[PDB]
Amino acid sequence: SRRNKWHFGVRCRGDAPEILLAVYRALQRAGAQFTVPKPVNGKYRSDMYTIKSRWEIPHCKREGKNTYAYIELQLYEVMPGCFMLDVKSNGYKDIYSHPERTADHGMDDLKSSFPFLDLCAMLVCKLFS
Amino acid sequence: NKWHFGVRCRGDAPEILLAVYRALQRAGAQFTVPKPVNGKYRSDMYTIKSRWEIPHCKREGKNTYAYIELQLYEVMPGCFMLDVKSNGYKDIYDDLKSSFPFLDLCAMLVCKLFS
Amino acid sequence: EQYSTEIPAFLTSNTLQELKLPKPPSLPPHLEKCILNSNTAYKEDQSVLPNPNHVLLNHLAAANTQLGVLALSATTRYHRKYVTTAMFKNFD
Amino acid sequence: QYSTEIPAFLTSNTLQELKLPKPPSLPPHLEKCILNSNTAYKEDQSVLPNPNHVLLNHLAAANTQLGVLALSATTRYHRKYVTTAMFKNFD
Amino acid sequence: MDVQETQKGALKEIQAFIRSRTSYDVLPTSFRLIVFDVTLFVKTSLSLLTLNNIVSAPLWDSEANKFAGLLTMADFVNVIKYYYQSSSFPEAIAEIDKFRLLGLREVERKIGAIPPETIYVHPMHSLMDACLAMSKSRARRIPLIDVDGETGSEMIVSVLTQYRILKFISMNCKETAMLRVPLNQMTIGTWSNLATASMETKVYDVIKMLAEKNISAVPIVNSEGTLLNVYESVDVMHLIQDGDYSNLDLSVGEALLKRPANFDGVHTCRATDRLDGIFDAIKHSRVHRLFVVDENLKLEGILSLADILNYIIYDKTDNFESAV
Amino acid sequence: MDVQETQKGALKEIQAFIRSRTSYDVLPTSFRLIVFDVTLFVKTSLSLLTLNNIVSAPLWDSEANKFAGLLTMADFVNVIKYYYQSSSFPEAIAEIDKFRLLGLREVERKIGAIPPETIYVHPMHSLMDACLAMSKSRARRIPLIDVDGETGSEMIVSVLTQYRILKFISMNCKETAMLRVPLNQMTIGTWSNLATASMETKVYDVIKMLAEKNISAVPIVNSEGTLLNVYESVDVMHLIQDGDYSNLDLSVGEALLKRPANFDGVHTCRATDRLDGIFDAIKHSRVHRLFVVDENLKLEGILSLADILNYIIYDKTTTPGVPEQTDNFESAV
Ligand SMILES: Nc1ncnc2c1ncn2[C@@H]1O[C@H](COP(=O)(O)OP(=O)(O)OP(=O)(O)O)[C@@H](O)[C@H]1O
Ligand SMILES: Nc1ncnc2c1ncn2[C@@H]1O[C@H](COP(=O)(O)OP(=O)(O)OP(=O)(O)O)[C@@H](O)[C@H]1O
């Protein structure tokens, strides 16, 4: 409570392209896996600023299983030179399902904030080093 | 919250004396044991001379050592001061008596005593 | 969609060089405010937050802390109620 | 002269018994640090009174509100006197 | 029917009511949960409680995406008491600031201060599980954890507090207004062997009572034994929130001069009072305990929250504080 | 004997005096050396700097018993500069706080912000060496360290300011009385191309000119050029002792209003003044700077302590490690 308060995602400055670059590299060295810009074949467009990342959930890895975190990242200009790297979980998924099981039906079971935040965090440490 | 000599102490002197030896045991320090004089023990017991493995010297070479005189005084009932005193550096083979290592060894003593 | 590992080939070349690539979208109004952005008296929870919205469900929100730690948070549904967990994690 | 082994009697239980030589008493000359002296920045707030030569290389400590040790000691360098005061990591 | 008999049936519904609700039910439709990385430094952690105005945070470890236990003011009460009354060195205590929550719990976990693994319930499980889980050990407040099946990761969902359980009850139970049997007539609250202090007791002595008596608070009384104030264990967070541990040598007195003006009341009642009102007080004000006083605010007993809650839930160095 | 010539003979006497004293000789007869553990967290390091009302401290590495360098505000101007222009996230310097002084100065090591070994001198070596050291190496104060031959350990004895050193002179050399050659005659102190912010100038930009012009302060003027104030890097300490790094987005204006009342002055003087008076302002107040100004408080140049000492300290030659490169960082304040 003094404008050191809550805002979405991660504030950014400088140039959009340069930022994306940071973000990939951040992802990169995090060990995430991302979606890469595709041009319409004259060259690029807005949605190059909309990355989708796959993350191996560290604890899942380390004890066998192969479960993934899906994180989409948007970048917005707020005013010139100013941006919000908007992060956003859109899920956790072990590649089937477990060894048995899938009781479902209403209404689609737990989406927890973790490990989403835990790697949101992991991201941020990369963006800041 | 400000500066005073040695290390403050609660309780019963000889416990403290024991605690001191103990923290004095687990830092690697050697030390004098009490001197019984006739029907046993003197107040000189609350006066440990200790000898110290410098770390950095018995690291890169040097058999170099370091002496600290621990003394316990009472200030009120149940309240004592462990006065710690640097008295030497002698590489076991005027001219600056730096406060180091002595302080770092103080740092260790202390750390020991507090856990 | 379709993923991965390497950083794009352009971008890496060096790229102040005109190219005048797309600018990112502008910030939409709903993303302009977190419910974590405060409160209300009558106890009983200083923990109650307004009903979040639907659309800003699972995003990342941050705050700086004067304490050498990270302040991360997100809002989710749990059955039919909404938990905004807020985490005070450490750095690296 | 130099043992490595905590005296037997001090050790175990009912250590609370036969004797009680007491420690001496805190001599007046301790009890006052040269480091609690000049509040003021007269040129150096670094500048201190002269220590008592006998209580020269002695340990002095202070509370910090920062989870660290505050250790100090006055030594004589040549003919002048550093009172070093380290803030060490607790560990 | 009978003042006595209508409590009976009241309780029978209050009990029946509790069971039919899930812990989940007590939660507000939309709340906020603050959760701390178990790796956080003690100091930092303590600041966090302060400017967030809370007394407790669930630890998260993550690494496990598992729950790392429940950080509460009892955490500092137990270690402080341990360090007093063992050691010999009065500033040994200040090392608590090197510590990380881990390390701290670790030490607590090696003196008896914490049961082998922390305590239970699932949110959709009966509210009774919650009470019984608290009841069977002060634990005073309890995490509600579920597991994200798809990930095997625990999802801390909230923390249920005796007070919020009771206030949610005072609110959903007509029956609370039919609990009108005077206390002097019921077996509730403690009324002999009261642990108390005077403005001149050292805070660390109080602290020493709180742990070994396992209590969250101690009534403060003058010579005539008039109730003046209390000393809670949250009042300890405020004593060391800035890392002054010598602050613990203050008489209760000087230490109350610190107490910031946020403070929920100190509630009193007469031995001839009854739950129905005590619930009504609960319904509106943040009670924690009530003290039983005579016409001259003389302390007759202590009715506490667990006291009450237990009373509802069934009608068929030694050593540590529970929670806060 | 002429004004021009009395100075000549004056400086020479001072010079010789400087060579006839050992750095030790500048130390009080009994003082207080505050020291930091390399391993301390940056956050603590600030609180401790501030508590003990000081702006630098020797670092100490018990492990080896060696001087670990000299923490200075520059360290902070320095990485702080580095983040603002080389990183696309504002918050995210913040991290600073996390670092231990080790991790911190290895980042400075990493960005070329501190040289490999640090310059130190033997307390019992001639004062002249310490003034050269400091002149050659642009460092505004230098640790004094000896060697305990018995243990082989490094005993920090003190750290000399340039200030203390001039004040040493001014108290000890009757000869300053005889320095009556106005400034504008003497080639000394910068007089052109002056970095200066306004009170609307963002606190990081000022931090920017500091590192990079490698200066300890920057005068704050206003439209009509009138000296208002000085922003010093020691003003940073206050800026972030709170652990609030958002504080760096303050106009110099606002950050100024946070400045606690213990500030030394802003010292102005006239282009036509002369070392003798300068040398004795030094004797009385605590001058860190001189903003050479005109009848109307309009800045004209900047006579500096290094300026002075260095000038008091070369007859024929300069010692060209002067300068070393463009857009560098910051010496040590
Ligand atoms: N000073 C005291 N002396 C003796 N018994 C007490 C004291 N304070 C509380 N008690 C009793 O100890 C038990 C503990 O109550 P509860 O589980 O709510 O936590 P508590 O901390 O003990 O209660 P409170 O919130 O009143 O401090 C209760 O039965 C209460 O009657
Ligand atoms: N604001 C400024 N603009 C331009 N040049 C400056 C400014 N401040 C100082 N200088 C020049 O650069 C050097 C600055 O001196 P220094 O680098 O030692 O920092 P300082 O503020 O002048 O302190 P000191 O008095 O210790 O020298 C001097 O040689 C001076 O002539």
Specify whether F27 is located in the same domain as F169. Answer: yes
Residue A16: Cβ-neighbour burial (10 angstroms; 0-12, 13-18, 19+): buried
Which CATH number characterizes residue B41's domain?
3.30.310.80
Name, in order, each residue with C-beta under 8 angstroms of F277's C-beta and a sequence gap of 6 or more.
Answer: F269
Strand A67-79 with A50-56, pairing: antiparallel
Specify whether E286 is located in the same domain as E230. Answer: yes
Beta bridge partners of A123: none
Q: Cα(C11)–Cα(E228) distance, rounded to whole angstroms?
A: 70
Q: Cα(F66)–Cα(F69) distance, rounded to whole angstroms?
A: 9
Q: How far is CA F38 from the centre of its chain?
A: 21
Specify whether F30 is located in the same domain as F165. Answer: yes
**Cα F218 to averaged position of ligand 2 atoms, centre (Å):** 8
Q: Cα(F62)–Cα(F158) distance, rounded to whole angstroms?
A: 18
Q: Cα(B19)–Cα(B109) distance, rounded to whole angstroms?
A: 11
Secondary-structure breakdown of chain D: helix, strand, coil percentages, each rounded to the nearest 5: 5, 30, 70
Range of the domain at F5: 1-180
Atom 18 of ligand 2, residue of closest alpha carbon: F306
CA-closest candidate to residue E242, choices F173, A59, D63, F288:
D63
Distances (CA, A) of D3 to B22, B40, D50, F60: 13, 18, 37, 32
| Token output for F290 | 């001189």
Domain edge (last residue) among E150, E180, E210: E180
Q: What is the DSSP letter of E250?
A: S
Residues making up chain F, counted from first to last: 333
CB F281 within 8 A of CB F267: yes
Specify whether F258 is located in the same domain as F298. Answer: yes
Strand locations in B1-115 (E): 4-5, 7-10, 30-31, 47-51, 67-76, 79-88
Amino acid present at F299: L
Does E297 contact ligand 1 (Cβ within 6 A)? no
Range of the domain at A105: 1-129
Q: Cα(A115)–Cα(A119) distance, rounded to whole angstroms?
A: 6
Q: How far is CA B15 from the centre of its chain?
A: 15
CA distance F152 to chain C (A): 35
Q: In testing the pocket of ligand 2, which one of F267, F304, F324 has its CB within 8 Å of the most ligand atoms?
A: F304
Q: In testing the pocket of ligand 1, which one of E201, E291, E302 has its CB within 8 Å of the most ligand atoms?
A: E302
CA-closest candidate to residue F56, choices F197, F216, F169:
F216
Domain edge (last residue) among E161, E180, E199: E180
Residues making up chain D, counted from first to last: 91
Which CATH number characterizes residue C64's domain?
2.20.25.290
Distances (CA, A) of C60 to D29, E114, E288: 62, 34, 35
Name, in order, each residue with C-beta under 8 angstroms of F116's C-beta and a sequence gap of 6 or more.
Answer: none
Per the entry, the structure determination technique was: X-ray
Amino acid present at F194: L
Specify whether F170 is located in the same domain as F193. Answer: no
In degrees and rounded to multiples of 5, residue F82 shows phi and psi of: -60, -40
Distances (CA, A) of E89 to B7, E205, F115, F256: 8, 16, 44, 45
CA distance D12 to chain E (A): 15
Domain edge (last residue) among E180, E203, E227: E180
Residues of B in Cβ contact (< 8 Å) with E87: 10, 19, 114
Q: What is the DSSP string of E13-66?
A: HHHHHHHHSBGGGGS-SEEEEEEEETTSBHHHHHHHHHHTT-S-EEEEETTTTE
Specify whether E128 is located in the same domain as E263. Answer: no
Specify whether F162 is located in the same domain as F192. Answer: no
Helices E305-313, E3-20: crossing angle, 10 deg rounding? 90
Q: Cα(F203)–Cα(F255) distance, rounded to whole angstroms?
A: 7
Q: Cα(B63)–Cα(B86) distance, rounded to whole angstroms?
A: 18
CB F319 within 8 A of CB F309: no
Strand locations in chain D (E): 60-61, 68-77, 80-89
**Cα F216 to averaged position of ligand 2 atoms, centre (Å):** 7
In degrees and rounded to multiples of 5, residue E244 shows phi and psi of: -90, 110
Q: Does D91 touch chain E (CB under 8 A)?
A: yes
Specify whether E168 is located in the same domain as E191. Answer: no
Q: Cα(E98)–Cα(D67) distance, rounded to whole angstroms?
A: 5
Does F304 contact ligand 2 (Cβ within 6 A)? yes
Range of the domain at D66: 55-91
CB A68 within 8 A of CB A93: yes
Is there a binding annotation on residue D1? no
Angle, CA E238 vertex, CA E233 and CA E243 arms, to 5°: 115
CA distance F158 to chain B (A): 12
CB F81 within 8 A of CB F207: yes
Specify whether F109 is located in the same domain as F195. Answer: no
CA-closest candidate to residue F205, choices F238, F251, F138, F156:
F251
Does F214 contact ligand 2 (Cβ within 6 A)? yes
Question: In b/e form, how buried is each residue of A84-96, taking b as 16+ CB within 10 angstroms?
Answer: bbbbbbeebebee
| Sign of the dihedral through C-alpha D23, D25, D29, D35 | positive
Look at chain F and report how many structural domains it folds into.
2
Q: Cα(E303)–Cα(E313) distance, rounded to whole angstroms?
A: 16
Amino acid present at B107: A
Mapping DSSP to helix (H, G, I), strand (E, B) and coil, where does residue E151 land? coil
Q: Cα(E40)–Cα(A67) distance, rounded to whole angstroms?
A: 28
Specify whether E140 is located in the same domain as E216. Answer: no
- Report the C-alpha dihedral over residues E164, E169, E172, E174, rounded to 10 degrees: -150
Residue with tokens 């000087």, as numbered in its chain: E254
Which CATH number characterizes residue E170's domain?
3.10.580.10
Residue C54: Cβ-neighbour burial (10 angstroms; 0-12, 13-18, 19+): exposed
Specify whether F251 is located in the same domain as F110. Answer: no
Residues of B in Cβ contact (< 8 Å) with F65: 56, 100-101, 104
Is there a binding annotation on residue C47? yes
Distances (CA, A) of F303 to A117, E291, F284: 54, 73, 18
In degrees and rounded to multiples of 5, residue B102 shows phi and psi of: -35, -45
Q: Do D7 and B5 touch (CB under 8 A)?
A: no
Amino acid present at E80: I
In degrees and rounded to multiples of 5, residue E265 shows phi and psi of: -55, -170
Helices F162-172, F275-284: crossing angle, 10 deg rounding? 110
**Looking at chain D, which residue has its C-alpha nearest residue F39?**
D89
Is there a binding annotation on residue D72? no
Look at chain B and report how many structural domains it folds into.
1
Q: Cα(E126)–Cα(E137) distance, rounded to whole angstroms?
A: 18
Q: What is the DSSP letter of E85?
A: T
Give the mutation candidate from E89, E202, E239, E245 for the B interface (greatest B CB count, under 10 A).
E89
| Token output for E277 | 């009102």
Specify whether F144 is located in the same domain as F55. Answer: yes
